[PDB]
Tab-separated table of C-alpha atoms in Angstrom:
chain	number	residue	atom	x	y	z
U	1125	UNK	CA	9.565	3.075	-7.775
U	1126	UNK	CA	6.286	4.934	-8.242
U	1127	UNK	CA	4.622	2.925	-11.356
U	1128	UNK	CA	4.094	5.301	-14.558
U	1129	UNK	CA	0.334	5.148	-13.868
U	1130	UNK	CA	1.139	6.824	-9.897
U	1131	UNK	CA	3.535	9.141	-11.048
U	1132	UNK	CA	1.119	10.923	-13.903
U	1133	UNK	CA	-1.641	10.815	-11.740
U	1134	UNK	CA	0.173	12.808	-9.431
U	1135	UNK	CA	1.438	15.016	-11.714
U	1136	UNK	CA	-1.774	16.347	-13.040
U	1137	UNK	CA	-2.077	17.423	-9.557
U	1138	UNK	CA	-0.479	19.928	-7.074
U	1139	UNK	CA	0.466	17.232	-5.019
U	1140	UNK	CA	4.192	16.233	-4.636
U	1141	UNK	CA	5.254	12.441	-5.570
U	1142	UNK	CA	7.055	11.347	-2.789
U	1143	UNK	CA	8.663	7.709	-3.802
U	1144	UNK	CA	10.079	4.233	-1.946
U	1145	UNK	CA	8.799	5.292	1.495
U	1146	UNK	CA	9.608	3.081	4.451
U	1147	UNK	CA	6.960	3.548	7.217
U	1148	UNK	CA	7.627	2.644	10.583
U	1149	UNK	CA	5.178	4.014	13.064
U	1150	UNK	CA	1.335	3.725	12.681
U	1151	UNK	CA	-1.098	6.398	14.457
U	1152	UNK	CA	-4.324	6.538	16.106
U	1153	UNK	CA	-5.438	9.656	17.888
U	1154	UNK	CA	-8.513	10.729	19.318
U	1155	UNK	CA	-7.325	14.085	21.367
U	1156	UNK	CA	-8.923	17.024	20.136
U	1157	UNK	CA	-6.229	18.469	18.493
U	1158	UNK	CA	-4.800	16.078	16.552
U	1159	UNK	CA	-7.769	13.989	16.258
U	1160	UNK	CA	-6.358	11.578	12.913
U	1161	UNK	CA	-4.682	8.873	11.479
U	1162	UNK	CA	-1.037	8.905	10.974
U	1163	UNK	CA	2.192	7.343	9.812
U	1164	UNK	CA	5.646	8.142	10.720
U	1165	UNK	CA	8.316	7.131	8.280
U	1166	UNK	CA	11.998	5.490	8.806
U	1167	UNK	CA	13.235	9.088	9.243
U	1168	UNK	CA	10.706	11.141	10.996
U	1169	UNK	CA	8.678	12.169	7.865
U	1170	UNK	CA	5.238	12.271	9.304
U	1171	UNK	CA	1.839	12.484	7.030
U	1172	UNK	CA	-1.956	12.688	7.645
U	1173	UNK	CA	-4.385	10.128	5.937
U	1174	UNK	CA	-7.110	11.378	4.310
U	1175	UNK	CA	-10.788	10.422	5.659
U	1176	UNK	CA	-14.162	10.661	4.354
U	1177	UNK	CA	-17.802	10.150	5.675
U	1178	UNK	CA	-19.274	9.208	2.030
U	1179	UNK	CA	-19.165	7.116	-0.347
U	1180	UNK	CA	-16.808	6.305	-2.516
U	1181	UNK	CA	-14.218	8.144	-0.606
U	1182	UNK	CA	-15.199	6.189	2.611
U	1183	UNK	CA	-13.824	3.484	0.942
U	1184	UNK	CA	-10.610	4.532	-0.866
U	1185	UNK	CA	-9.890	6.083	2.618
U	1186	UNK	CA	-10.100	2.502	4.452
U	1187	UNK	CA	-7.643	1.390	1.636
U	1188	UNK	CA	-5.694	4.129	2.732
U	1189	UNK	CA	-5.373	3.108	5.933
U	1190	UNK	CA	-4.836	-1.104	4.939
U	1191	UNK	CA	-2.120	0.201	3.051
U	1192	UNK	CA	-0.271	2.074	5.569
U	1193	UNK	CA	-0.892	-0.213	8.019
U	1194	UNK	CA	1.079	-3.338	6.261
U	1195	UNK	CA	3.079	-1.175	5.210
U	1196	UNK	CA	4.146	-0.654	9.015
U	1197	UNK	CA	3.538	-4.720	9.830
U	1198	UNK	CA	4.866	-5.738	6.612
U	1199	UNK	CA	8.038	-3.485	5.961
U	1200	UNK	CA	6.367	-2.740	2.572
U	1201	UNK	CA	7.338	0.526	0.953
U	1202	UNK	CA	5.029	3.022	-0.529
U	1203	UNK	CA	4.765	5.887	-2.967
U	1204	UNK	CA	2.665	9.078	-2.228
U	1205	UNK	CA	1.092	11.820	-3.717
U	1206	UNK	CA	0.735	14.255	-0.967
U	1207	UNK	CA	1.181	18.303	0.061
U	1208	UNK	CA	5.393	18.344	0.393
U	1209	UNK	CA	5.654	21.441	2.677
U	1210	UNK	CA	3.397	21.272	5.558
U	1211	UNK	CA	4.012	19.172	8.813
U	1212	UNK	CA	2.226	16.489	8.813
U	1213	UNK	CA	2.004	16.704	5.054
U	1214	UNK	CA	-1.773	15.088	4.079
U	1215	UNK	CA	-1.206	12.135	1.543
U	1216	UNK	CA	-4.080	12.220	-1.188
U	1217	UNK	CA	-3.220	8.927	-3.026
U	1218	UNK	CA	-0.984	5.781	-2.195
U	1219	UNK	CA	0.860	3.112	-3.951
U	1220	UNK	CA	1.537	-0.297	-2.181
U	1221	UNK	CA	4.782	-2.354	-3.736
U	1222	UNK	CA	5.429	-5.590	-3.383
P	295	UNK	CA	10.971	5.170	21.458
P	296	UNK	CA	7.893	7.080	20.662
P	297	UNK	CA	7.619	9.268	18.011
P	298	UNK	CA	8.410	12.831	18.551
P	299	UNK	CA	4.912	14.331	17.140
P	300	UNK	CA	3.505	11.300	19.064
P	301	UNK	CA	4.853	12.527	22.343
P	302	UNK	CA	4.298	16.267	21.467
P	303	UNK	CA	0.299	15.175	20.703
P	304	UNK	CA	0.247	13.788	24.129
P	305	UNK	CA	1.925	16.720	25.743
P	306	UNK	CA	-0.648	18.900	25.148
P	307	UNK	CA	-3.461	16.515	26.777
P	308	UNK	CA	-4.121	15.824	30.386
P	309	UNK	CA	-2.880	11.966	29.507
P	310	UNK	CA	0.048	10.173	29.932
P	311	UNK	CA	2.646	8.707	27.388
P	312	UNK	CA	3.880	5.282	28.191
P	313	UNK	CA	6.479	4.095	25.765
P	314	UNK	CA	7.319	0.480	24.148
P	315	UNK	CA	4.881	-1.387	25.689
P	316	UNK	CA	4.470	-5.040	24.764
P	317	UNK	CA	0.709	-6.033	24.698
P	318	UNK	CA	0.420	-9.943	25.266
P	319	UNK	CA	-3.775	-10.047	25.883
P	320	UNK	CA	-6.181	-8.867	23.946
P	321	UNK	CA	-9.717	-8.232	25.373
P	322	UNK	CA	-13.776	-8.416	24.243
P	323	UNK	CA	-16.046	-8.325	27.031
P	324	UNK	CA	-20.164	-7.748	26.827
P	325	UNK	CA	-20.217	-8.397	30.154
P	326	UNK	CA	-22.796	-6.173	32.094
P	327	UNK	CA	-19.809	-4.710	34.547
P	328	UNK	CA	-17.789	-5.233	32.311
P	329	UNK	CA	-18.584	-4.169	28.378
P	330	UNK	CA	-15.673	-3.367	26.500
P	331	UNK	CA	-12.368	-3.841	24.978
P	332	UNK	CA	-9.195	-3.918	26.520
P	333	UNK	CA	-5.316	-4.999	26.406
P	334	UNK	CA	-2.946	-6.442	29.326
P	335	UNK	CA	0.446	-5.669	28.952
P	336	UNK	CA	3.948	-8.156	29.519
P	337	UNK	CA	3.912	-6.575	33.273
P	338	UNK	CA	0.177	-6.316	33.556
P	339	UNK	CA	-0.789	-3.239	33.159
P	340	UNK	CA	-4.602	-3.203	31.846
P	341	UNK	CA	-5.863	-0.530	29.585
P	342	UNK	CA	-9.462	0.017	27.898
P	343	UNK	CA	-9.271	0.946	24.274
P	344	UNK	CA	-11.680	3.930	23.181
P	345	UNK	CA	-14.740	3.744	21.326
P	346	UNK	CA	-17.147	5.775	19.450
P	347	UNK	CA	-20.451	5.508	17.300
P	348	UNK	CA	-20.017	8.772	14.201
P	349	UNK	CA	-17.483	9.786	12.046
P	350	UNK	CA	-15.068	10.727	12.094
P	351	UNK	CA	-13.619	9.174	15.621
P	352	UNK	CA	-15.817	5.807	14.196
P	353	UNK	CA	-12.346	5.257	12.182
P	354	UNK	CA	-9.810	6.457	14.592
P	355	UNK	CA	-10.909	3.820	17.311
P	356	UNK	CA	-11.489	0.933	14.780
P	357	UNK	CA	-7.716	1.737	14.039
P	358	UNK	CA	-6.730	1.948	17.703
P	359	UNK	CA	-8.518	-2.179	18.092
P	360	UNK	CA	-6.787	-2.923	15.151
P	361	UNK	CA	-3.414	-1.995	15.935
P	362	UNK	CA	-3.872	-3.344	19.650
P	363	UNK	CA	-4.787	-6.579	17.894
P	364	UNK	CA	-1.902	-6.650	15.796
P	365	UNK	CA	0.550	-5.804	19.004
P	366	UNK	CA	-1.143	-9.250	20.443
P	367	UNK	CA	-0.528	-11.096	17.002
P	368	UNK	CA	2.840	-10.160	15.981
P	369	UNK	CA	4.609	-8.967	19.350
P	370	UNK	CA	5.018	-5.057	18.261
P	371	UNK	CA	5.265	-2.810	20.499
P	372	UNK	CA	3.079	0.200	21.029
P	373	UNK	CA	3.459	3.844	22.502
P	374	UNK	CA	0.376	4.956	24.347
P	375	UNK	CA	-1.475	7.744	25.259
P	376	UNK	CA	-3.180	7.100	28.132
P	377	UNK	CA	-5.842	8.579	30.354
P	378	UNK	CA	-5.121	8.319	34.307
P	379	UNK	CA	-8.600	9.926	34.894
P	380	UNK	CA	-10.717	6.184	34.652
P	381	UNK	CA	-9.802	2.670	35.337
P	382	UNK	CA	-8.274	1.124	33.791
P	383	UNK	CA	-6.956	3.918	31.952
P	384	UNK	CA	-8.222	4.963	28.999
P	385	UNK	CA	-6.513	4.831	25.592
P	386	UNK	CA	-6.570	8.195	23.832
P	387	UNK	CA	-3.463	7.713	21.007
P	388	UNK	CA	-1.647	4.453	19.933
P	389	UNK	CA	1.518	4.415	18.011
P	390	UNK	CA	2.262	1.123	16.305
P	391	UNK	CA	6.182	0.334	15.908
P	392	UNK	CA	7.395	-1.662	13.354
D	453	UNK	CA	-5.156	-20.924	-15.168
D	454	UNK	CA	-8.475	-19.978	-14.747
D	455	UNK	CA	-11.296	-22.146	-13.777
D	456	UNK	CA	-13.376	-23.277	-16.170
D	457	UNK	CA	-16.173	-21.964	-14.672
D	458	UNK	CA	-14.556	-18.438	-14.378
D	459	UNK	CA	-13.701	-18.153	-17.897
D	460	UNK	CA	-17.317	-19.305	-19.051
D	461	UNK	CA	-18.692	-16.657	-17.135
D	462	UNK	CA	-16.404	-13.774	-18.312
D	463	UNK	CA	-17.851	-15.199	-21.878
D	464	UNK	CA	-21.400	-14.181	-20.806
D	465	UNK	CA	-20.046	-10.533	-21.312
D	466	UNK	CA	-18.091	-8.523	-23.351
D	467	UNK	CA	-14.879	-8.682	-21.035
D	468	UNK	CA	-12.156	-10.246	-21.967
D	469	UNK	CA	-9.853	-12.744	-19.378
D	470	UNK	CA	-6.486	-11.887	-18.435
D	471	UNK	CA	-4.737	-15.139	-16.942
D	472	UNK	CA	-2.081	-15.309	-14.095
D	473	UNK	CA	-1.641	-11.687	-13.594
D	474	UNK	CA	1.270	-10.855	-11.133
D	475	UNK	CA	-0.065	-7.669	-9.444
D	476	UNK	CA	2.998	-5.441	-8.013
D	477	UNK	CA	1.191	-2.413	-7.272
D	478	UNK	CA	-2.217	-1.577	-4.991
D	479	UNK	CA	-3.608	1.914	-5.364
D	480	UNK	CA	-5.326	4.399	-3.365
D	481	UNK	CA	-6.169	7.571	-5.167
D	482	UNK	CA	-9.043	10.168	-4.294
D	483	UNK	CA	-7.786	12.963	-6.308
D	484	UNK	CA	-10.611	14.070	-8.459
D	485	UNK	CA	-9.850	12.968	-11.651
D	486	UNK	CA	-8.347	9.720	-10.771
D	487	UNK	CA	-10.498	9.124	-7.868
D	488	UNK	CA	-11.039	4.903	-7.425
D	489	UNK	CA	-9.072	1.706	-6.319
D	490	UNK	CA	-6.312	0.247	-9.125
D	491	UNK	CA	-3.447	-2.549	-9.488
D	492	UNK	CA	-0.586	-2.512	-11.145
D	493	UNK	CA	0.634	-5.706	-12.784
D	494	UNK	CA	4.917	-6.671	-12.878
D	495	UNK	CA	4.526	-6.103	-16.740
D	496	UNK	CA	3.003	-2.671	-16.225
D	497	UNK	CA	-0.419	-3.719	-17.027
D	498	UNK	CA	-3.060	-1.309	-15.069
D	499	UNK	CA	-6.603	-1.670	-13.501
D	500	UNK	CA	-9.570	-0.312	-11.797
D	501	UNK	CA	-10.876	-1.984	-9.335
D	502	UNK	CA	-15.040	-1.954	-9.457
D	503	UNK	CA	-17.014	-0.117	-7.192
D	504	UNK	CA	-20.945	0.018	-5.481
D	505	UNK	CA	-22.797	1.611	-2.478
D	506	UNK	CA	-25.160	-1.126	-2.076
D	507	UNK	CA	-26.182	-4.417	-1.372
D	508	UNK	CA	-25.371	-7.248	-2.789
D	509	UNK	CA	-22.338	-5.391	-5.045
D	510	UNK	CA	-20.696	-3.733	-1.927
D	511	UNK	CA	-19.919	-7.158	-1.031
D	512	UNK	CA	-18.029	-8.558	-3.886
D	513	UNK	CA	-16.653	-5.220	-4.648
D	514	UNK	CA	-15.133	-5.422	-0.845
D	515	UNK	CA	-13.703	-8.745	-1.632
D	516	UNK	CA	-12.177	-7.828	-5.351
D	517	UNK	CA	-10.569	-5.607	-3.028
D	518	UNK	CA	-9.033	-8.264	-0.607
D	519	UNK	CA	-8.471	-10.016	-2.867
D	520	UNK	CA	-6.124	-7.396	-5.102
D	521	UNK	CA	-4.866	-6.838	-2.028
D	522	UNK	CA	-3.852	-9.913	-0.984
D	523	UNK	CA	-2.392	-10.979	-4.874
D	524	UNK	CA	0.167	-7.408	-3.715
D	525	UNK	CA	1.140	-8.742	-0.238
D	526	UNK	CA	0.995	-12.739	-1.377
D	527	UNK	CA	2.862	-12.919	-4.752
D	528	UNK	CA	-0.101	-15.169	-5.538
D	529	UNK	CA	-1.577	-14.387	-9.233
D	530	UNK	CA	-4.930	-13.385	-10.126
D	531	UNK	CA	-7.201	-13.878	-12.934
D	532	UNK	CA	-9.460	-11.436	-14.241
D	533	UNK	CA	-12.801	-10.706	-16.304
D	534	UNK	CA	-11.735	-6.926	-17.318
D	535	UNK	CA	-12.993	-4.729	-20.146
D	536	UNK	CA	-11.243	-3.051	-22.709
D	537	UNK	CA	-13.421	-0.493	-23.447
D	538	UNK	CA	-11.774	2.200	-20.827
D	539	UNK	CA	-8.702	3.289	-19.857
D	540	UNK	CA	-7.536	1.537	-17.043
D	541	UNK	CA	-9.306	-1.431	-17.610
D	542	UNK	CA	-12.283	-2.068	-15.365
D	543	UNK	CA	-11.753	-6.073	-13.403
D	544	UNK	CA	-15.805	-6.978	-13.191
D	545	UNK	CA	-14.526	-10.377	-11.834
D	546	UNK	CA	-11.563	-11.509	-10.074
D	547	UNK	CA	-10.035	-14.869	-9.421
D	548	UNK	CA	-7.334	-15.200	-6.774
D	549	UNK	CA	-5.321	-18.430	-7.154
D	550	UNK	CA	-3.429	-20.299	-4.499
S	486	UNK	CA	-2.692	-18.100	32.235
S	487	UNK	CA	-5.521	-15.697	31.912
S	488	UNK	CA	-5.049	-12.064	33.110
S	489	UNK	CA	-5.961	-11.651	36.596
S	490	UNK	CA	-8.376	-8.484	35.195
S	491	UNK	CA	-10.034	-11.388	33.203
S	492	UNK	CA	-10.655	-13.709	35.775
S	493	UNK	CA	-11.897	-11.002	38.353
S	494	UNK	CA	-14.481	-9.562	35.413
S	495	UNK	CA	-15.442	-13.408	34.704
S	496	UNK	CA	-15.892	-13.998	38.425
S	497	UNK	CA	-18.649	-11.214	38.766
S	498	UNK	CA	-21.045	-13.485	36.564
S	499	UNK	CA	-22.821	-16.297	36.572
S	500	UNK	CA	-20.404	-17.811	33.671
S	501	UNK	CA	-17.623	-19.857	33.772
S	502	UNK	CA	-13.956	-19.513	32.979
S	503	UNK	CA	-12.343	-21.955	30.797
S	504	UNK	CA	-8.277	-21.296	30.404
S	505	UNK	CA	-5.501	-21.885	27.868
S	506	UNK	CA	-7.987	-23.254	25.534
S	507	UNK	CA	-6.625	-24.447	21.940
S	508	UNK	CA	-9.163	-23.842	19.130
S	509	UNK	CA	-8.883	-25.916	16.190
S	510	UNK	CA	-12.357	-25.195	14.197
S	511	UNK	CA	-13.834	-21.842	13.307
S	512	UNK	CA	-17.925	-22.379	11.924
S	513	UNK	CA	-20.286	-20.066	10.534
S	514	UNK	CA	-23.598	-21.501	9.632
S	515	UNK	CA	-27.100	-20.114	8.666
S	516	UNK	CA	-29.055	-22.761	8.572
S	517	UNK	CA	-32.803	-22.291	10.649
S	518	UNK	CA	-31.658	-24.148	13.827
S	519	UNK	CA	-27.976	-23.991	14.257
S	520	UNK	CA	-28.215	-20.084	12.509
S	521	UNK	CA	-24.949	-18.787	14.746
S	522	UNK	CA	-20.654	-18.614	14.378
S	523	UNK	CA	-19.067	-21.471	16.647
S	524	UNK	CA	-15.780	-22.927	17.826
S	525	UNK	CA	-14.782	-25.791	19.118
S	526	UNK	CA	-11.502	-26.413	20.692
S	527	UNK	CA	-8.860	-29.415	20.915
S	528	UNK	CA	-10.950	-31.597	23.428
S	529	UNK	CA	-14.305	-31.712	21.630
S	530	UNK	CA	-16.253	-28.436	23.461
S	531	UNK	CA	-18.155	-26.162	21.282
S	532	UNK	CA	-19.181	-22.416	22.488
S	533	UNK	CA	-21.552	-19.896	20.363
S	534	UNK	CA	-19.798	-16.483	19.935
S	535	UNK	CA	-22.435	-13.999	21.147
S	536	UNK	CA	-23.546	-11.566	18.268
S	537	UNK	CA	-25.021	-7.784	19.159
S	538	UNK	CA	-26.898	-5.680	16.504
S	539	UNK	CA	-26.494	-2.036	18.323
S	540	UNK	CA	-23.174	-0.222	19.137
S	541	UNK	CA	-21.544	-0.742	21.058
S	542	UNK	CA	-21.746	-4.714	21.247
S	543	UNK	CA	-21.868	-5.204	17.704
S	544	UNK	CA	-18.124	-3.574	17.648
S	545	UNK	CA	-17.108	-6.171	20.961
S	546	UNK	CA	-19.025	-9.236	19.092
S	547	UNK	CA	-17.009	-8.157	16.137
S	548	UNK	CA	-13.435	-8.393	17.635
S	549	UNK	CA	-14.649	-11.508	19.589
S	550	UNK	CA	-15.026	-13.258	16.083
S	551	UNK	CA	-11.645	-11.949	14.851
S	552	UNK	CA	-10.113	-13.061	17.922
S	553	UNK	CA	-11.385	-16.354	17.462
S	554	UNK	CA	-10.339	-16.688	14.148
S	555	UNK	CA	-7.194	-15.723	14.706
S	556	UNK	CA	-6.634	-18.340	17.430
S	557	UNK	CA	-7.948	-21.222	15.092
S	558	UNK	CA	-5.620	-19.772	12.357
S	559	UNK	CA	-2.495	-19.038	14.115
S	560	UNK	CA	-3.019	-21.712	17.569
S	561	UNK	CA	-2.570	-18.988	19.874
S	562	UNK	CA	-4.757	-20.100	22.994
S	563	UNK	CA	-7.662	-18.255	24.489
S	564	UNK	CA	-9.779	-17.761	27.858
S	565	UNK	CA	-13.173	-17.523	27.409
S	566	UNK	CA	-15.874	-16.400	30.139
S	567	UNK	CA	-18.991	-18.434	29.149
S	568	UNK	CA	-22.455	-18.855	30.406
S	569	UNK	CA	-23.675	-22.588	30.242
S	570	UNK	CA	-27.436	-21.317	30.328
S	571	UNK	CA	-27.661	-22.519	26.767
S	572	UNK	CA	-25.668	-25.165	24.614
S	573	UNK	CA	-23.112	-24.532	22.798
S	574	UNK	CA	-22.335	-22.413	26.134
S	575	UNK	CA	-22.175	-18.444	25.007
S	576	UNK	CA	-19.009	-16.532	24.953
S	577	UNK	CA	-19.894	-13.650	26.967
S	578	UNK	CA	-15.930	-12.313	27.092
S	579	UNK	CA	-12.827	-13.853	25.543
S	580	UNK	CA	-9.132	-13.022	26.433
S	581	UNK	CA	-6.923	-13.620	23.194
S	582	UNK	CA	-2.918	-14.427	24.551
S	583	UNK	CA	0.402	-13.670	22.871
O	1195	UNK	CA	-12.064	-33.992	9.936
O	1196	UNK	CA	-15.425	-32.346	10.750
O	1197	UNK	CA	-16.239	-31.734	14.286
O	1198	UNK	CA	-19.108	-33.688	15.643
O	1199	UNK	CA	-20.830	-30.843	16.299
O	1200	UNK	CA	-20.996	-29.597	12.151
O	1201	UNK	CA	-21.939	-32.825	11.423
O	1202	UNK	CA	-24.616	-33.193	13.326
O	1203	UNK	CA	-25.826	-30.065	12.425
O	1204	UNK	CA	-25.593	-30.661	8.537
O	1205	UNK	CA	-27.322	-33.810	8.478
O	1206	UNK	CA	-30.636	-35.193	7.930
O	1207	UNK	CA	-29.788	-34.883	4.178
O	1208	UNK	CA	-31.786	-32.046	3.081
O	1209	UNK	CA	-27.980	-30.574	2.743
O	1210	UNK	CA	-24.815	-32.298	1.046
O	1211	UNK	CA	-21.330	-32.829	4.040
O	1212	UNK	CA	-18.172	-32.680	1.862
O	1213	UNK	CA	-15.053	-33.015	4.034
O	1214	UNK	CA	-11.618	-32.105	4.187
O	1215	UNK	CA	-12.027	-30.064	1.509
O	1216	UNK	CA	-8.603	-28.094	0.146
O	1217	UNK	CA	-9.747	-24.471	-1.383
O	1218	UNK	CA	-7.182	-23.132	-4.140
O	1219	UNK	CA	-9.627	-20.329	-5.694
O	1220	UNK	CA	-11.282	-17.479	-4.354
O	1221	UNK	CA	-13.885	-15.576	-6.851
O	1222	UNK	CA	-15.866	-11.987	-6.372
O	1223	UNK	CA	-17.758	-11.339	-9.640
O	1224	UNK	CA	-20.512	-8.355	-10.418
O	1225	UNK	CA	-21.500	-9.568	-13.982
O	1226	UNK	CA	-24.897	-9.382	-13.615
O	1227	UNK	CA	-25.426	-13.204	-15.201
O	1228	UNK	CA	-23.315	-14.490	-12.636
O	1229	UNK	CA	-23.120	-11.911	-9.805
O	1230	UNK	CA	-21.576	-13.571	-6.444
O	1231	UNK	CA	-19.229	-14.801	-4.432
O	1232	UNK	CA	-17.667	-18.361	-4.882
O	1233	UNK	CA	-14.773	-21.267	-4.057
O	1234	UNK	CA	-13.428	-23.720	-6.409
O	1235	UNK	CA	-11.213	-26.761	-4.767
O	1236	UNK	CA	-8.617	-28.675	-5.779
O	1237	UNK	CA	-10.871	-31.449	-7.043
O	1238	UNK	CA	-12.299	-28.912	-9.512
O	1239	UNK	CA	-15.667	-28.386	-7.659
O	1240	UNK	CA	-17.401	-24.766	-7.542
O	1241	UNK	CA	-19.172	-23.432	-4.603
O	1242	UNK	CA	-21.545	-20.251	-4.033
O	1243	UNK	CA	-20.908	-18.410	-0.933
O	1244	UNK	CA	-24.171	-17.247	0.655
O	1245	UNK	CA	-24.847	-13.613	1.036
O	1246	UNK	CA	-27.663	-11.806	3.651
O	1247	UNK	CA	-28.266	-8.423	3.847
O	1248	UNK	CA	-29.909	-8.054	7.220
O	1249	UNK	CA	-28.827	-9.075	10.599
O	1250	UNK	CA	-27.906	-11.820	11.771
O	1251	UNK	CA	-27.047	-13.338	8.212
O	1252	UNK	CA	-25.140	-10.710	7.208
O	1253	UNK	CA	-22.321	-11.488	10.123
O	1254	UNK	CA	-22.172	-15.112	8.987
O	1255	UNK	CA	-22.100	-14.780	5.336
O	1256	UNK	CA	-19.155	-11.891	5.764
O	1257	UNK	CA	-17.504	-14.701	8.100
O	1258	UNK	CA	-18.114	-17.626	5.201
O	1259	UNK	CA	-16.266	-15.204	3.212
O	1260	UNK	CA	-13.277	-14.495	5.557
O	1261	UNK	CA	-13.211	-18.661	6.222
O	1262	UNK	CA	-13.327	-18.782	2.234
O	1263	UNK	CA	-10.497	-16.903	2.037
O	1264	UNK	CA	-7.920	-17.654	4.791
O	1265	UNK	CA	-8.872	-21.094	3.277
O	1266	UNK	CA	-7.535	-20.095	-0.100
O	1267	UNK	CA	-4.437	-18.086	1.505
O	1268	UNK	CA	-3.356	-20.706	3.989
O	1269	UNK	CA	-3.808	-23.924	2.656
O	1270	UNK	CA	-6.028	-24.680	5.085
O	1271	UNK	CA	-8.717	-27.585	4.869
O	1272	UNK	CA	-12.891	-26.513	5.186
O	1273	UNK	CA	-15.933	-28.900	5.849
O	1274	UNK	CA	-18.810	-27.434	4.330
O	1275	UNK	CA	-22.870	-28.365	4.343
O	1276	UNK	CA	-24.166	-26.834	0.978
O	1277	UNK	CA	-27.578	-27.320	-0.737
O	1278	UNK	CA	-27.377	-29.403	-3.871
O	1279	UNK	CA	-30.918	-27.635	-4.706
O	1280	UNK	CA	-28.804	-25.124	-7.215
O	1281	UNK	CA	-25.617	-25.712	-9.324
O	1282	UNK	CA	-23.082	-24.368	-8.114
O	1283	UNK	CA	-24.357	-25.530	-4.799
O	1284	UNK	CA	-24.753	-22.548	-2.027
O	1285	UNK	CA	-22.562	-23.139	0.907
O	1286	UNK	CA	-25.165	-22.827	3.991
O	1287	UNK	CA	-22.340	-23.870	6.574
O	1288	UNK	CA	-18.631	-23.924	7.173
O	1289	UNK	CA	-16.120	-24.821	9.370
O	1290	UNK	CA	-12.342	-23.893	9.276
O	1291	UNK	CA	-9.710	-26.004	10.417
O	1292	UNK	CA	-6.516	-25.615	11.905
């Protein structure tokens, strides 16, 4: 489950916690509309990840993506903070468990 | 099977979708004729990945090697978006199954 | 345990060491109050994981990150040099152990 | 056996095609005359991974190195299209198989 | 043991060979007293990783540290040539093995 630390930060946020996530599908897309990085989840869920040109965001970004991605190779489940209404719904923080 | 916002994204493009390929090559070439990267399928099919210098498609195609690689590595299979328009066809969206 | 020579450098500062840390949890966060990289540990124990733009600090911070990173994927425990005086804890040094 | 795609781009230089080789050591080194990253495989040959500063080689020299690496870690063979104008002989294109 | 080739470039003795050597710690620290990257084996001995800025260093040093590390991670055995000029001594070469 989310760890205390995830879960408040994502409180003091609009964000929705969204917990014990099993991602399946990993997405790179370069077509002009949907020009992103993605990941689908064992049930269809779909979500955005965040990117950034600057620093430090370039970087927590990047660890975005590493995350997802084992995630996906690893069968690793994550909690998110992210919108909870939209399609794809963008995640703004991510939790890795072991 | 791909995803279903997977195949919708490559609906709307001129591309094609191929679906649960197994990628068993994985390509670097500086080659004059021949600079790039690429992937060869279990059948043979031969695609080139995309590339690109700025942000924010700098990310999306380091993703698209990366999950290409990891295909290779850990014999996943991939749903692509492909481009009939060069040769070999041109990567424009990856999906990464677990 | 540590190495010796990691705990004599922690002693050159005011951190303290924290020895064979199990970390359970690897964060992602770029909402704006919580913005930065953290662990959790399997006794609820939380970090933040340094940061820096430039050279030579972008390197090791890059590799505290692996290396957190790794300790979440690997089950293999970590030592750190962290400071108490903020809330998380900041890890200045990291030691991952086989 | 090497993709026919490979063989064909390997064929339109002036290198050489070497097949199904095992790598077993993976060397960086900066010393002033041997300043370069290496690998020798199983029977004793050594070849010089090429390195590019500018896009878009430095992202091909990149995933040559990781390919490379890869095969030393994990034995998966490679095929490598090298030019013996210099020795080590330079990797020009390498062809990493499942 | 070390290929042929890493010995030959190592010696003349201006530079120390050690052999077969078994990693089991991986350091990144940013105190400013003690600011690097280093390796401590089995045996107890501690290594600095070198670190470059510019190209063409800068590839090799980031590839010392990925060697370091899959080192650590896999069990695998290095050969290094380091200077025995500073204490730790500075890894100038290193060579992976499968």
């Amino acid at each position: 489950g989310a760890s205390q630390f995830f879960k408040d930060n994502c409180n003091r946020t609009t964000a929705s916690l969204v917990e014990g996530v099993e991602l399946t599908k990993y997405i790179s897309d370069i077509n002009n509309n949907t020009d992103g990085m993605y990941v689908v989840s064992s049930t269809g869920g779909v979500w955005r990840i965040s990117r950034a040109k600057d620093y430090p965001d370039n970087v927590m970004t990047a660890e975005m993506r590493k995350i997802a991605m084992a995630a996906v190779l690893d069968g690793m489940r994550v909690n998110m903070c992210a919108s909870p209404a939209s399609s794809p719904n963008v995640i703004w923080a991510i939790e890795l468990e072991a």
